[PDB]
Amino acid sequence: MSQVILDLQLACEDNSGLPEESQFQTWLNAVIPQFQEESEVTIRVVDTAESHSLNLTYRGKDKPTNVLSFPFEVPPGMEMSLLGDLVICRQVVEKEAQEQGKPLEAHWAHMVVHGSLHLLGYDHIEDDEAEEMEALETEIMLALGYEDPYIA
Ligand code: NI
Description:
Strand content: 15-25%
CATH superfamily: Metalloproteases ("zincins"), catalytic domain
Name: Hypothetical UPF0054 protein ybeY
Oligomer: monomer
Order of helices and strands: EHHEHEEHHH
Organism: Escherichia coli
Distance between the termini: 37 Å
Bound molecules: nickel (II) ion
Helix content: 40-55%
PDB class: structural genomics, unknown function
Assembly: monomeric
Entry title: Crystal structure of metal-dependent hydrolase ybeY from E. coli, Pfam UPF0054
Structural class: alpha/beta
């Protein structure tokens, strides 16, 4: 099997100019299935304020970020398909894509791809650990038809 049930939550004042739910679905299929097959993730797009708040109260960082990853812990001895949530700030994503001169769409995809990896247990604090994650990101991204966000 291969199935990623997506719960897309648009929680911005506007909600216009965001990726189509099918796009998120597409990006999600290129990252998760190959690790869980049967799974489901929630992804809510928010505004700087909420992001700022979530980031400060859960990561202890006074500022908004592009992607907050909240991986679901599975209680010892339990079958669970729920992977966690991705909180993506549209303001940050749009600003970054502009500063890095990347296609807004390609950056969004990167956000859910990177985020999804964090949901699956990947991290990038340790050089070796990061090397493995970026390798995967690059791979997934090329397979989606976007340029490799790395190699700069
Ligand atoms: Ni990260």
